[PDB]
Amino acid sequence: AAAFVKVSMDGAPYLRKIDLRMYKSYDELSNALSNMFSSFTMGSWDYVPSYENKDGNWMLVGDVPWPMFVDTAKRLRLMKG
């Protein structure tokens, strides 16, 4: 049951896509992303993830437990402090 969203890093040159169904915990998602943008990050992780629900609004990542997260989130964005 694959679940592919887009991931935007602010300031990144381009955007990426991930399959959420290939990960199990938030922490398992978080270190997966830091390595996607690892080539951008070098030169810790100081960004905060946000997703966007089905009604088109931006919600912070981590509140709702993981299984409902994978069904709720349609797009990803990592903002800088």
């Binding site: 935007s8 040159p13 381009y14 896509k17 080539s39 951008f40």
Partner: protein
Amino acid sequence: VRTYTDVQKTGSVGRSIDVTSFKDYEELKSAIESMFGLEGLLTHPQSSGWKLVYVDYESDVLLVGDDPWEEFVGSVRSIRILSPTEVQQMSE
């Protein structure tokens, strides 16, 4: 009615190709490689520093290869080659 998606590179002159002529991502890169003389730089185990990106019909700019092939053929609108330097005018 076939795709005929534009492929573009700064300093060379653009090309139009049909992505359905190829079955997977690798064949798409290897063809684009041989068209601009970049053979070996888009398809390298060690991530050459050249990047290939596309624009989807939602007008975002995305790395080629993430989307499953079958969705991408339908989403892709224009493709573009980015030199190591170009990749970084775009970073911040």
